[PDB]
Amino acid sequence: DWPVYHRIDGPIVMIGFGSIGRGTLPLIERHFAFDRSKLVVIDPSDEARKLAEARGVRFIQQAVTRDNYRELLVPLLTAGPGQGFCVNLSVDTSSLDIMELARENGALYIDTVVEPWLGFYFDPDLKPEARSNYALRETVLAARRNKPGGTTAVSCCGANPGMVSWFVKQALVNLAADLGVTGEEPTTREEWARLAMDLGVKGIHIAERDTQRASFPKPFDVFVNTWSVEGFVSEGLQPAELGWGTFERWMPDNARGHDSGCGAGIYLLQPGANTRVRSWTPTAMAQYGFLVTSNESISIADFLTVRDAAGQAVYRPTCHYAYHPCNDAVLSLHEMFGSGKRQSDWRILDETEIVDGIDELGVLLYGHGKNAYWYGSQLSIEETRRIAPDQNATGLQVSSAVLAGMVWALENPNAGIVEADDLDFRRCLEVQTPYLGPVVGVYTDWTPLAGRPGLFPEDIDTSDPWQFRNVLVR
Amino acid sequence: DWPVYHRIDGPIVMIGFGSIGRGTLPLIERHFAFDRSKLVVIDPSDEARKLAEARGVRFIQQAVTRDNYRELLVPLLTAGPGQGFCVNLSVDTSSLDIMELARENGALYIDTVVEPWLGFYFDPDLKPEARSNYALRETVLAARRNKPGGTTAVSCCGANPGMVSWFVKQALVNLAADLGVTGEEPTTREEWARLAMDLGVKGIHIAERDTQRASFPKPFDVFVNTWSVEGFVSEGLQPAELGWGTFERWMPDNARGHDSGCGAGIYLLQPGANTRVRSWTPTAMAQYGFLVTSNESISIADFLTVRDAAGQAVYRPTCHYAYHPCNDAVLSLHEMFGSGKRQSDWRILDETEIVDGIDELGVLLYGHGKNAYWYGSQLSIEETRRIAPDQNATGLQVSSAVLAGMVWALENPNAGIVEADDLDFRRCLEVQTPYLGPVVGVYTDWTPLAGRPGLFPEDIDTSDPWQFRNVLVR
Numbered sequence: 001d002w003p004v005y006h007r008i009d010g011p012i013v014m015i016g017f018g019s020i021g022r023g024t025l026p027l028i029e030r031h032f033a034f035d036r037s038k039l040v041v042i043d044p045s046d047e048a049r050k051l052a053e054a055r056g057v058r059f060i061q062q063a064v065t066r067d068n069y070r071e072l073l074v075p076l077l078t079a080g081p082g083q084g085f086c087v088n089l090s091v092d093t094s095s096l097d098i099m100e101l102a103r104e105n106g107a108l109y110i111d112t113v114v115e116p117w118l119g120f121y122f123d124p125d126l127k128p129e130a131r132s133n134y135a136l137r138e139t140v141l142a143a144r145r146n147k148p149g150g151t152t153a154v155s156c157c158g159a160n161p162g163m164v165s166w167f168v169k170q171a172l173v174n175l176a177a178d179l180g181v182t183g184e185e186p187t188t189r190e191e192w193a194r195l196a197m198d199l200g201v202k203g204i205h206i207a208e209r210d211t212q213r214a215s216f217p218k219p220f221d222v223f224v225n226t227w228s229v230e231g232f233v234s235e236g237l238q239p240a241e242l243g244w245g246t247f248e249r250w251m252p253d254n255a256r257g258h259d260s261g262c263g264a265g266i267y268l269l270q271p272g273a274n275t276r277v278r279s280w281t282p283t284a285m286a287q288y289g290f291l292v293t294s295n296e297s298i299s300i301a302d303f304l305t306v307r308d309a310a311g312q313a314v315y316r317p318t319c320h321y322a323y324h325p326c327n328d329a330v331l332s333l334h335e336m337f338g339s340g341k342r343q344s345d346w347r348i349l350d351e352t353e354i355v356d357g358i359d360e361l362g363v364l365l366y367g368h369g370k371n372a373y374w375y376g377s378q379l380s381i382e383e384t385r386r387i388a389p390d391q392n393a394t395g396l397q398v399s400s401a402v403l404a405g406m407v408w409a410l411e412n413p414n415a416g417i418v419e420a421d422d423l424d425f426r427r428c429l430e431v432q433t434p435y436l437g438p439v440v441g442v443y444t445d446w447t448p449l450a451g452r453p454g455l456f457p458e459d460i461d462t463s464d465p466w467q468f469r470n471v472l473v474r
Numbered sequence: 475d476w477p478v479y480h481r482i483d484g485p486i487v488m489i490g491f492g493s494i495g496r497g498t499l500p501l502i503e504r505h506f507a508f509d510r511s512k513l514v515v516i517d518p519s520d521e522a523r524k525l526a527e528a529r530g531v532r533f534i535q536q537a538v539t540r541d542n543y544r545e546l547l548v549p550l551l552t553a554g555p556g557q558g559f560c561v562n563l564s565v566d567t568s569s570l571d572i573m574e575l576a577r578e579n580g581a582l583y584i585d586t587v588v589e590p591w592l593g594f595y596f597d598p599d600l601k602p603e604a605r606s607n608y609a610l611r612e613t614v615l616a617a618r619r620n621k622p623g624g625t626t627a628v629s630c631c632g633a634n635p636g637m638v639s640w641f642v643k644q645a646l647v648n649l650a651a652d653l654g655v656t657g658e659e660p661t662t663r664e665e666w667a668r669l670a671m672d673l674g675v676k677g678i679h680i681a682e683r684d685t686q687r688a689s690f691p692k693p694f695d696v697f698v699n700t701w702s703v704e705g706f707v708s709e710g711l712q713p714a715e716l717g718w719g720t721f722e723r724w725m726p727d728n729a730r731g732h733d734s735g736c737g738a739g740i741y742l743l744q745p746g747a748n749t750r751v752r753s754w755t756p757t758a759m760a761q762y763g764f765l766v767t768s769n770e771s772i773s774i775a776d777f778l779t780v781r782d783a784a785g786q787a788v789y790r791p792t793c794h795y796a797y798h799p800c801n802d803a804v805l806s807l808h809e810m811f812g813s814g815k816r817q818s819d820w821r822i823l824d825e826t827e828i829v830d831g832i833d834e835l836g837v838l839l840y841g842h843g844k845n846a847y848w849y850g851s852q853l854s855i856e857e858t859r860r861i862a863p864d865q866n867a868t869g870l871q872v873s874s875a876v877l878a879g880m881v882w883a884l885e886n887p888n889a890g891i892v893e894a895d896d897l898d899f900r901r902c903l904e905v906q907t908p909y910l911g912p913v914v915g916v917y918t919d920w921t922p923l924a925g926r927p928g929l930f931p932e933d934i935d936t937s938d939p940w941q942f943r944n945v946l947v948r
């Protein structure tokens with residue numbers, strides 16, 4: 001039977017009951033021991049309420065806001081008798097503020113994104129830099145510097161960001177082993193960064209192809225996706241953003257850096273979901289991905305940075321998302337950007353509405369001696385239905401990563417604010433792997449210069465195929 | 475009863491029996507009197523052979539090539555009694571060479587495209603300019619100069635190019651009445667151009683939205699379209715191309731012109747089917763179109779050119795395609811350009827495989843006192859099935875235009891080499907309109923600057939919304 005990993009000796013407050021909350025609830029019920037009445041879900045949606053009622057769980061129909069979050073969450077999280085867990089799977093709420101509240105009150109915390117309070121992105125006074133995930137992540141890093149240690153709070157532990165950080169570590173270990181380099185895995189950040197450097201990893205794509213197909217044709221003026229439409233659209237309209245590698249010799253005119261922080265990132269003055277990059281996955285082969293911002297684009301690049309004695313970064317990989325979402329989402333983006341406005345309506349594909357497909361999600365490490373190596377999950381919708389209810393393949397990759405992060409936090413409850421790169425990757429993947437379907441590593445000789453130059457002149461760097469100059473669709 | 479317009483007393487030689495041939499042959503049988511045994515269909519494919527045999531129509535299973543076209547076609551064209559008609563609906567054949575052969579032998583000719591002999595576009599020696607439809611059109615214009623008058627040959631008489639030239643004329647007439655511009659209806663090229671000038675038409679999009687949806691989900695590694703995949707892909711990989719208006723104040727760095735010829739065109743050093751433009755149709759509202767080259771982009775701009783005494787152009791409209799193909803074609807393009815190569819397979823949607831949708835195809839005239847005006851056809855697949863067999867809505871707009879061109883050529887058989895702009899638009903529309911479904915004019919206040927500037931800085935021209943600088947997606 002399914003492993004029960006830990007007892008939760010206090011309230012479980014789930015904030016948000018959308019596609020991820022719905023997929024995560026049954027895993028929490030499955031894998032943790034707790035009096036069922038300890039769990040309560042908070043979401044303003046009527047649709048969410050009706051589903052919660054059907055699932056028999058306590059439900060509070062309320063939006064968490066800057067104005068009410070303390071009066072609402074403090075009593076719920078401290079109801080006792082022991083340590084509670086705030087599982088934040090919402091939109092429109094401040095990850096940082098909720099995380100800091102949980103910590104102040106001794107509750108564990110996890111989320112899958114650094115989200116700001118509602119209103120954040122449509123303020124007519126926020127410059128593009130302030131919209132970036134770099135900036136948002138810096139608020140979390142600052143919180144950690146201000147209050148080191150204390151109760152564990154796991155930031156950005158979904159599929160991506162989240163799981164993909166563990167994939168990068170496993171991929172680095174495999175690359176070394178495949179070269180016949182034996183010896184202990186790295187144990188410190190510095191050792192991981194040096195392993196990437198020593199293997200000659202120039203960069204990393206979070207290389208995803210979602211092939212889930214709907215049972216109905218795409219409706220006009222409806223945005224369709226396999227996870228949050230609101231969240232995807234919001235992220236898609238943020239600047240394109242990437243961790244910026246030391247090997248890069250060119251950036252677009254509209255690229256910008258940051259005055260402060262870890263130094264690992266740049267962003268482009270254009271929306272990520274309307275920015276294409278040339279990339280590759282095992283099922284897609286060569287494909288376009290969208291250069292949508294993601295926390296791990298920065299966090300992984302930062303994590304794998306090697307500095308000289310003077311503190312200057314001398315090695316860092318490029319890192320960014322190369323996302324090919326489901327066909328209906330591709331059409332939805334073309335519709336949205338073509339119209340200049342959000343569709344009037346949206347829907348998230350339910351497992352009952354998906355005829356077939358997988359969410360192929362992995363990390364593509366490139367520039368090393370074997371050119372490119374993709375490592376990740378090929379979870380199908382059919383396998384998903386066999387192993388976890390109320391979600392599609394996209395959702396299960398996320399919900400199972402939340403499960404893994406929750407197990408890690410319960411096992412390591414005094415670790416302070418941590419990112420996915422800080423967790424024990426082997427333990428997290430041991431928890432998650434039952435929900436990931438095939439997890440495979442595949443080498444390819446494909447590069448962004450395959451078939452180039454073609455019929456027209458192009459500004460390419462033929463000496464270094466994986467330069468962003470060659471990857472970016474221009 | 476359907477009108478039988480004329481008797482055709484000689485051979486009817488149909489070159490190519492793909493999607494358009496299959497839709498055109500029944501209209502030919504319906505609307506012309508002739509002995510059925512005088513029709514001959516030539517196509518290399520077994521698929522076509524079986525379809526022609528099912529119709530009891532004479533079939534020759536050959537590819538027409540530069541090597542064989544004279545020995546193959548001359549006996550067919552001249553079999554008598556009296557004047558034959560060459561109906562060229564093929565790919566991979568030289569429109570100019572076959573046209574010249576037909577003329578030399580006194581046969582009428584019609585096609586829907588200026589196509590080169592197979593091998594043309596894979597010539598790695600070929601400079602981009604030589605790939606352009608402007609160049610191909612110039613070979614036809616030079617043929618007309620070399621041999622003025624003589625037997626009628628109608629070049630590029632499909633839906634677009636073809637029918638849309640007639641829509642431009644009607645739209646100009648409608649604009650003149652709605653704007654209160656007095657004067658007799660034009661009856662010469664010079665008068666038409668002067669009317670466009672007087673109305674202040676800055677430019678024209680061939681503004682198309684195909685909403686035909688398939689009964690099956692898009693297959694991986696299959697290019698799906700509603701008409702020729704080979705043709706669309708070929709055109710899609712040609713340079714983006716447009717008739718270039720005198721009002722334009724900016725062109726991109728990768729734009730180029732021509733050293734000779736009519737002067738009406740530019741092209742961009744990038745593939746047209748991977749070039750997006752901001753455009754509009756009544757059903758789509760604001761949308762992206764692809765800037766795919768088309769003969770009429772040049773022919774309409776040229777036709778509507780006003781010159782001073784020196785022969786310098788003082789007015790000319792911008793004119794180009796802004797094509798939003800069916801959803802499966804949009805996905806197919808993303809797949810093809812993302813992979814850097816043609817899919818392994820392709821299919822053209824049969825009417826039996828289309829669940830719903832329309833081919834909304836018109837002309838969007840902009841820059842005048844009522845901003846923008848769209849005029850064209852909203853033909854649905856349902857209406858298509860009721861009125862014509864063996865084709866979808868895309869096919870019927872094309873096949874009915876070929877019918878109109880054939881009627882016109884029979885009534886005007888010594889007009890020499892002509893384009894759709896040279897034909898009597900009222901007579902052609904009188905023949906075609908029964909097959910076009912709703913034909914409507916719609917004004918809109920939309921402009922390419924709607925919603926702009928937005929979240930990010932953009933290199934726009936705020937002085938004049940319709941500038942190509944604002945239309946082109948960068």
Ligand SMILES: NC(=O)c1ccc[n+]([C@@H]2O[C@H](COP(=O)([O-])OP(=O)(O)OC[C@H]3O[C@@H](n4cnc5c(N)ncnc54)[C@H](O)[C@@H]3O)[C@@H](O)[C@H]2O)c1
Nearest residue numbers: 017018019020045063064090091112158159160161228231
């Ligand atoms: N790291 C990853 O891999 C990953 C993957 C998917 C989603 N996410 C993120 O997880 C979150 C949930 O995604 P989803 O697919 O479930 O989204 P969703 O849009 O399906 O659901 C979001 C839910 O939040 C609720 N909500 C809105 N305002 C709220 C408020 N003020 N307080 C409480 N709840 C509120 C909505 O009613 C909705 O049910 C999103 O922020 C998304 O960006 C991360």
Ligand SMILES: NC(=O)c1ccc[n+]([C@@H]2O[C@H](COP(=O)([O-])OP(=O)(O)OC[C@H]3O[C@@H](n4cnc5c(N)ncnc54)[C@H](O)[C@@H]3O)[C@@H](O)[C@H]2O)c1
Nearest residue numbers: 490491492493494537538564565586632633634635702705
């Ligand atoms: N102006 C317009 O509106 C318009 C619209 C659609 C198509 N077209 C053009 O019309 C033509 C026909 O389109 P379609 O949808 O029927 O294309 P299709 O791809 O369905 O059919 C093309 C046919 O040509 C045949 N063919 C190939 N090589 C040949 C050769 N050497 N000699 C004779 N036949 C040969 C093929 O076997 C096939 O049956 C294409 O060139 C296309 O570009 C124009």
Ligand SMILES: N=C(N)NCCCCN
Nearest residue numbers: 159160161235292293294
């Ligand atoms: N990483 C993002 N920008 N969004 C969340 C993506 C989740 C789909 N695997």
Ligand SMILES: N=C(N)NCCCCN
Nearest residue numbers: 633634635709766767768
């Ligand atoms: N005009 C072209 N480039 N191709 C022909 C398109 C026919 C779709 N109405």
